[PDB]
């Protein structure tokens, strides 16, 4: 019975830690923010559609300077877009058609992508030559590689679907650290600015908070109900907005550690694929699997916009670091700047 | 670089991809004759896909097949324990919201094997589904020539089991395709490549709506 | 958090008579399919039977097709299986399993030991 005496600490436990919760629990997001104005109705249009991909785009990443867009397909194709022109900067094919993660480097030397070939291969855009070649390729992941994300140059953080998250030099090769702790197939990451910590969403329902350096899972939110594919923090850091297949975004606090707000509406019976906030991260906008996206607001969960024209799934959108424009990709291989 | 996205193009659309997905006991291997393997035949080339090295959470990854233009399913008609599985298997698959608008192609695979099995007396279907005894053997169906009624009785049930769940739902968007494979078969490539052409052809005509 | 607890179990006559109770917190119990699931000693996972949202549709496995009753109680979110003559081959640990995807009836809660959200069941013994 030593097992079942374990267990039963472990609810207790989780019971001390409900109640901690609860004790400072007072009050509302939505009930302070009653008393400011509604952001009003968001207006938004396609101001550039980028054809060429010939699968559907299953994941896409901004740049750092607000021009420069990556798209994965299906079609084994890795495309980096100038978003200004509407021009095809590379095509980068993949050695595995199945790509299902791709990440721009912050210096933009780099290009990653990953997906059921469990590895995440990463290629050089700055080359002398001037041809795409595979700069270095990861394995070790038993588990399809679901999201990649470049903390720097030299190190990327990934998530794959073996329930890890591992940290990767680029010079050595190998997994410096490995993130354990999720019962679920991670889905995606995102990084903080400050690139200290990140929190992963897995399949489990659950949104865990690791810390680069030290390797650790730092917090545990419980909030949603069903598998969690969004992950987003929020621009100041201390809070980031997950959303799930149960057709809603909950709003969860670092320092809070509880949930903080819900954006859910009774008629949406979809789930939800990719988030992003805004320059201010009053802003929030969602993915969804009713061939359109929804603009929610961070402090009234309200509608305020609906991002219409898409054939298919939102797989992924994404918003510059300058918050110019959004950018939104579906399953019916058209990429749509909004502004 | 528009040039060669332009042949790229012609080259995606003429290949036909598909997903090889069974039960490890059911011989995906056989059925062809890293994972990943190529057959042309009819001048038309045909990409097939054996995703064998991921988890079993399959409810993830299987979004990335959407697109495919049919499912080859392999199932083992030797094992009784393991058929309530599959059909567990391919009800998911059927049901699927993602895979709702592709065909699937099912393979009875090792039929040959089935044969000893029902012929010795030792294993009987009926412990495992009760309604074999009351099944009779349609008058459409055609038994195989030199065979057992039993064999024929036996290796059909399994087949309409399995089509009870295609016709429950669907909506005429996705259809079936079950076939009988015996542990050796060169035919499986042609059967492939004759429904695969059939799903085409039944694709347009819902296109049109004449279906 | 989502949660599954499951109640009674234990050694049981065989021929008898077992209703065990799933309790569901975390979640809304009216918007998901339901199933419950056994593991026999030395054997993996198999599924029994499920439920849809509002119970119209309800299906078995061929092992308890018409010995077993099965139903769910949206009203206080319990979900109920009633089991009836008891074999030896029926005692296993039996798991209250709910499909991930909401206003869905496709799921995958055959996977073995890699689930969260499957209870952690009960031990059932048929002398």
């Known amino acids: 019975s030593e097992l079942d005496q374990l267990r039963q600490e472990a609810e207790q436990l989780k019971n001390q830690i409900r109640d901690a919760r609860k004790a400072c629990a007072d009050a509302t997001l939505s009930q302070i923010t009653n008393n400011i104005d509604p952001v009003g109705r968001i207006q938004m249009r396609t101001r550039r559609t980028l054809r060429g991909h010939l699968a559907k785009i299953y994941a896409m990443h901004w740049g750092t300077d607000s021009r420069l867009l990556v798209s994965a397909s299906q079609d084994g194709k890795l495309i980096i877009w100038d978003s200004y022109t509407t021009n095809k900067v590379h095509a980068i094919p993949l050695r595995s058609s199945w790509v299902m993660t791709c990440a721009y480097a912050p210096s933009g030397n780099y290009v990653a992508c990953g997906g059921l070939d469990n590895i995440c291969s990463i290629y050089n855009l700055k080359t002398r030559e001037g041809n795409v070649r595979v700069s270095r390729e990861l394995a070790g992941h038993t588990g399809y590689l679901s999201c990649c994300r470049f903390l720097d140059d030299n190190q990327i953080v990934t998530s794959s679907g073996d329930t890890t998250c591992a940290l990767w030099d680029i010079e050595t090769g190998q997994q410096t650290t490995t993130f354990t702790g999720h019962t679920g197939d991670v889905m995606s990451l995102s990084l903080a600015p400050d690139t200290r910590l990140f929190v992963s969403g897995a399949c489990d329902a659950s949104a865990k908070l690791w810390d680069v350096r030290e390797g650790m899972c730092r917090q545990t939110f419980t909030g949603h109900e069903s598998d969690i594919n969004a992950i987003c923090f929020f621009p100041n850091g201390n809070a980031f907005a997950t959303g799930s297949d149960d057709a809603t975004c909950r709003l969860f606090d670092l320092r809070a550690d509880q949930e903080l707000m819900t954006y859910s509406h009774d008629n949406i019976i979809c789930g939800i694929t990719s988030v992003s906030f805004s320059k201010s991260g009053r802003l929030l906008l969602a993915g969804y699997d009713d061939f359109n996206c929804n603009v929610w607001d961070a402090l009234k969960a309200d509608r305020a916009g609906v991002l219409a024209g898409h054939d298919n799934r939102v797989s992924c959108l994404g918003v510059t670091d300058d918050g110019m424009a959004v950018a939104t990709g579906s399953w019916d291989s058209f990429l749509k700047i909004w502004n | 670089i528009e040039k060669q996205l332009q042949k790229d193009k012609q080259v995606y659309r003429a290949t036909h991809r598909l997903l090889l997905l069974g039960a490890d006991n059911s011989g995906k291997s056989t059925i062809v004759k890293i994972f990943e393997t190529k057959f042309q035949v009819d001048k038309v080339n045909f990409h097939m896909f054996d995703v064998g090295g991921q988890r079993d959470e399959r409810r993830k990854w299987i979004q990335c097949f959407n697109d495919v233009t049919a499912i080859i399913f392999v199932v083992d008609s030797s094992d009784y324990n393991r058929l309530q599985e599959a059909l567990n298997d391919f009800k998911s698959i059927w049901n699927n919201r993602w895979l709702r608008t592709i065909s699937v192609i099912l393979f009875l695979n090792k039929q040959d094997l089935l044969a000893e099995k029902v012929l010795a007396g030792k294993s009987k279907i009926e412990d495992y589904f009760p309604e074999f005894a009351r099944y009779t053997t349609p008058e459409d169906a055609t038994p195989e020539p030199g065979e057992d009624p039993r064999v024929t009785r036996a290796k059909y049930f399994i087949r309409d089991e399995f089509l009870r769940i295609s016709t429950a739902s669907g909506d005429g968007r996705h259809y079936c395709y079950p076939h009988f494979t015996c542990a050796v078969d060169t035919e499986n490539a042609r059967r492939i490549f004759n429904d695969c052409r059939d799903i085409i052809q039944r694709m347009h005509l819902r296109q049109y709506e004449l279906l | 958090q989502v949660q599954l607890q499951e109640s009674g179990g234990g050694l049981v006559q065989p021929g008898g008579s077992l209703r065990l109770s799933c309790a569901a917190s975390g979640f809304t119990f009216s918007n998901y399919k339901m199933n419950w699931v056994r593991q026999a000693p030395g054997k993996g996972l198999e599924w029994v039977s499920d439920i849809s949202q509002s119970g119209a549709s309800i299906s078995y496995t061929g092992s308890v097709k018409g010995r077993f009753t099965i139903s769910r109680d949206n009203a206080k979110n319990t979900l109920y299986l009633q089991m009836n003559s008891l074999k030896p081959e029926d005692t296993a640990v039996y798991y209250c399993?709910?499909?991930?995807?909401?206003?869905?009836?496709?799921?995958?809660?055959?996977?073995?030991?890699?689930?969260?959200?499957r209870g952690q069941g009960t031990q059932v013994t048929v002398s």
């Open positions: 399993a709910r499909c991930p995807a909401p206003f869905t009836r496709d799921c995958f809660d055959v996977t073995s030991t890699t689930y969260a959200y």
